[PDB]
Design a binder for this molecule. Structure first.
Ligand SMILES: C[S@@H](CCCN)C[C@H]1O[C@@H](n2cnc3c(N)ncnc32)[C@H](O)[C@@H]1O
Ligand SMILES: C[S@@H](CCCN)C[C@H]1O[C@@H](n2cnc3c(N)ncnc32)[C@H](O)[C@@H]1O
Ligand SMILES: CN(C(=O)[C@@H]1COc2ccccc2O1)c1ccccc1
Lengths: 290, 269
């Protein structure tokens, strides 16, 4: 029930005693969905953010910084794979990661599965620059639970799986869980790479340590956390765990540098120097990566 | 019960107790204990802008103090301009090569309040290798002879020529360098103006600071001497005996910090 000229306020128990607030210039969508609360608004036009999307009260995408996380998830993973022909996105309803994955000419086909069909609908309508990808004939966009999708996928189906979900607290709770990640390992081909929505070193450092140990133990050969700067996420950063099925692979140095591909100059955040830099963690977090 | 920092966006931390809140002769100083259920601890703000929190002050203090000193061949005489809380000084003093550090901050009330409410940061203010002055830094460098300092660190809220002049030929200057998200145009202008004033190289080092607006800040690392590549450590911290006492900075972070997002890379490359 947001109102134009009102303020949107983001607080949350997973981060007690801090809040981020954006003045609302224009409400575009604000309603319960089958699965979560979807809010879209145009932010103050004197500010840089543009249109904002929140899911259950938490900002997911803004026009001004959406390229960071989408470019990092899409390119760090695909530039770590020797020939990524078939790709799966779990979540990713807004289309950002799909847009970056489809930059790559090796990609033959990408499946995307998001549980909330209204997220796709609202992104088509209000984020055309993020959502254009969803209509690509190289994509198959499905509405469905990613958990069920992967359980019903045959062994060895994908080169890369990217898990672009919400918090562990919402409809995305088991996509930080155990039959799920074993399923991801199983549906990956031998040289398979997985990357996930990775949580913050400031708020979630214990979860990150736990996830990384347990991804390795379920049977991934290596797991390395890449940090990135996202100004609208709590505490200004988020990371992704980049995981290799195959042993002997060093994801922290690009296997297929983007500089050699024809779109490198269209990117606004990612390049090979940012890719390598993203695996250097502050000392207090470095034990994640060794 | 919230401290609000502010077009059309705000960032708030909940206040548990107000420790200090007065104008100073120079600026508005607010110090508070934040929500004990969150991590931030005691928080200091100046003119409505968060400057220091217990939880994350190590970042900016380690990056400024060590990025600069690890880029100098032998840093023995160091000047800090601003830095009244003590945190850059604490990092500077870890280095065995440092004979002496002068620190000059315009606001003595900041020093006083830091000794009172941030003792893990301001203990450094009473080190015998340090001299703390209360005074304007512009007037201080104007009155400093040529080739006085190996390193000048500008940790603030005719000058850059004075800085260039008071540095020795191998001198390194670093500053509080602003945000690539909020101030990108100012960073490009400053990086040109510092090169024009005479510094031979300027490179911006980016860092993750949760309590600064949009979660990052940076520092311009400027070398008086031509041909110096500050983006790789000249004297790696891993070879010094305090490397493991640090919570943020190491040689990998040093290198990484000069890798800028494509949209900002024209600052460095
Ligand atoms: C919007 S995207 C996050 C913003 C960065 N692109 C988060 C998506 O994860 C979906 N999500 C959450 N749980 C699931 C499950 N179980 N399966 C698939 N997609 C999911 C959710 O509907 C969002 O669209
Ligand atoms: C708080 S410190 C920055 C916080 C990260 N340690 C910023 C200091 O710079 C001082 N400052 C501001 N202007 C000047 C001048 N002109 N000279 C010296 N010190 C100054 C100001 O009083 C703050 O204490
Ligand atoms: C620590 N901190 C933040 O993370 C701010 C506010 O809380 C947020 C919550 C959700 C997203 C982004 C947020 O940015 C901060 C607090 C006060 C001042 C500056 C920074």
């Amino acid at each position: 029930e947001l109102i134009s000229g009102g303020w949107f306020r983001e607080e949350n128990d997973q981060w007690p005693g801090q809040a981020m607030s954006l003045r609302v210039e224009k409400v575009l969508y604000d309603a319960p969905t089958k699965f979560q609360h979807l809010t879209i608004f145009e932010s103050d036009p004197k500010g840089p953010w543009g249109t904002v999307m929140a899911l259950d009260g938490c900002i997911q995408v803004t026009d001004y910084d959406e390229f960071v996380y989408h470019e990092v998830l899409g390119h760090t993973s695909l530039c770590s794979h020797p020939k990524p022909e078939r790709v799966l996105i779990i979540g990713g309803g807004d289309g950002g990661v799909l847009r970056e994955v489809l930059r790559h000419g090796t990609v033959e086909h990408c499946d995307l599965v998001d549980i909330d069909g209204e997220v796709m609908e609202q992104s088509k309508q209000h984020f055309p620059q993020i959502s254009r990808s969803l209509a690509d004939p190289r994509a198959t966009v499905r509405v469905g639970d990613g958990l069920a999708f992967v359980r019903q996928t045959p062994d060895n189906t994908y080169d890369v799986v990217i898990i672009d979900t919400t918090d562990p607290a919402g409809p995305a709770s088991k996509l930080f869980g155990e039959a799920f990640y074993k399923d991801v390992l199983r549906i990956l081909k031998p040289d398979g790479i997985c990357c996930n929505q990775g949580e913050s070193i400031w708020l979630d450092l214990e979860l990150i340590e736990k996830m990384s140990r347990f991804i390795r133990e379920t049977g991934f050969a290596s797991v390395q956390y890449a940090l990135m700067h996202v100004p609208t996420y709590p505490c200004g950063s988020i990371g992704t765990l980049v995981c290799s099925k195959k042993a002997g692979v060093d994801v922290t140095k690009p296997l297929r540098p983007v500089e050699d591909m024809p779109f490198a100059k269209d990117l606004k955040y990612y390049d090979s120097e940012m890719h390598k830099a993203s695996f250097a963690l502050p000392r207090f977090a470095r034990h994640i990566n060794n």
